[PDB]
Amino acid sequence: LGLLPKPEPKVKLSNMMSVFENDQNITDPTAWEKVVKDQVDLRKRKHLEENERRHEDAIKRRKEAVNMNVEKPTVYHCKVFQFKNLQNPKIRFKLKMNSKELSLKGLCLRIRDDGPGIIIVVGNEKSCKFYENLVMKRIKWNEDFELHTNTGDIKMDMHNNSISKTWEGYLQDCKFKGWFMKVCNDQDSLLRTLGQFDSEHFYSPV
RNA sequence: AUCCUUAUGCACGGGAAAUACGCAUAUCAGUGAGGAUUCGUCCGAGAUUGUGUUUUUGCUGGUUGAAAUUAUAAA
RNA sequence: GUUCGCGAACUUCGUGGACAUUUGGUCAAUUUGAAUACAGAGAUCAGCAGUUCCCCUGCAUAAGGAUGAACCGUUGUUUU
């Protein structure tokens, strides 16, 4: 009740020989072949083009969508860990980038660079879990690594270093505005820093 | 950001089948349908009824035949 | 009586069989107030898509994993 488009015959290289609606099918053999192969390509290309378009639009959406979603978080899972040492760059990098990725409110404090330190990680539960996994399974805090400096590249054998999850709880409010990794010269300083969020307790002296 | 799992949705592509595939102001149904069994047990999702098509829906193309047939106008 | 056969002088005598019958056989159609018709009016070949179920492939969403990536992050005259 329209004739707004038209419906043609879907040829392929197995039909090819059997379609006669479109002309030239034996007349101009290679022309016909080109047409049919070309058609097939278009079909495939169209499919691929469609996929590409979808990919694009999704991407466009996602950026906007993230920005839009400033939802009010009802409850925050938290996990606070502590490590004997982290003179490795790699571990630090992991802690950073992962945190950045996962909207992970928290920090990683420590004493005297080489000394022991704490991580406090907070957010949605899945993210927290992921972080924990990264800490415990993915990273080896008992690995031997290299320090790159001007004086010389220093080998750091650390079989002694280890990592433990202290806490794994739910915090009434997450007072951590972001992920504020730090170092301190002393324990008192560290404590003070911790209490900037009105919460010292996360640390555990052993 | 990279790789994978599942489900789905959209499609390319490749197949098989339409004896199949629906629909319901229906009756029942994981608060058990229908089935297994070595008999101790086991699987666990439709069944009943009614009914619409079902040697097929929608469209295209050819040959043909069919009989396939040619405008006006001035000297 | 009507046929076929055989014995005696086509023709005739002597003789042995067999001898029903009709129903089941109306073209329709049109023009009638019997004529026209005349058996009664798309075929065949071939694509494609649809429907269902499957498998693959790429994309999307949901979820859910796994993994990577250096390095530290935030609460009295020259360097003021």
H, E, C per residue of A121-160: EEECHHHHHHHHHHHHHHCCCCCCEEECCCCCCEEECCCC
The experimental method behind these coordinates is cryo-EM
Q: Which residues pair with A165 in a beta bridge?
A: A81
Rounded to 5 degrees, what are φ and ψ at A12? -155, -175
| Closest to A130 (Cα-Cα) out of A99, A86, A85 | A99
Cα distance between residue A49 and residue A68, in whole Å? 29
Is A32:A24 a contact under the CB 8 Å cutoff? Answer: yes
**Interacting residues of A171 by C-beta distance below 8 A, sequence separation 6+:** A76, A78, A122
The reply to whether A5 has its C-beta less than 7 Å from any atom of strand B is no
| Closest to A120 (Cα-Cα) out of A40, A44, A200 | A200
The reply to whether A63 has its C-beta less than 7 Å from any atom of strand B is no
The reply to whether A153 has its C-beta less than 7 Å from any atom of strand C is no
Cα distance between residue A164 and residue A187, in whole Å? 19
Distance from CA(A10) to C1'(B19), angstroms, rounded: 30
Domain ranges of chain A: 1-73, 74-205
- Sign of torsion over alpha carbons A56, A57, A62, A68: positive
Would you state the structure tokens that stand for residue A64, as one six-digit string? 């906007």
| Closest to A84 (Cα-Cα) out of A117, A112, A107, A131 | A117
Would you state the structure tokens that stand for residue A28, as one six-digit string? 């101009």
Cα distance between residue A16 and residue A200, in whole Å? 78
Is A21:A35 a contact under the CB 8 Å cutoff? Answer: no
The reply to whether A11 has its C-beta less than 7 Å from any atom of strand C is yes
The reply to whether A43 has its C-beta less than 7 Å from any atom of strand B is yes
CB burial of A158-196 (b: ≥16 within 10 Å; e: otherwise) equals beebebeebbeeebeebebeebbbebbeeeeebeebbee
The distance in angstroms from the start CA to the end CA of chain A is: 84
Nearest nucleotide by C1' position to the A97 CA atom: C69
Q: What are the Cα distances from residue A27, in Å, to A11, A17, A30, A33, A35?
A: 17, 12, 9, 11, 13
Protein-proximal nucleotides of chain B (any atom < 7 Å from a CB)? 1, 9-15, 58-62
The reply to whether A44 has its C-beta less than 7 Å from any atom of strand B is yes
Cα distance between residue A162 and residue A135, in whole Å? 11
Is A81:A166 a contact under the CB 8 Å cutoff? Answer: yes
The reply to whether A175 has its C-beta less than 7 Å from any atom of strand C is no
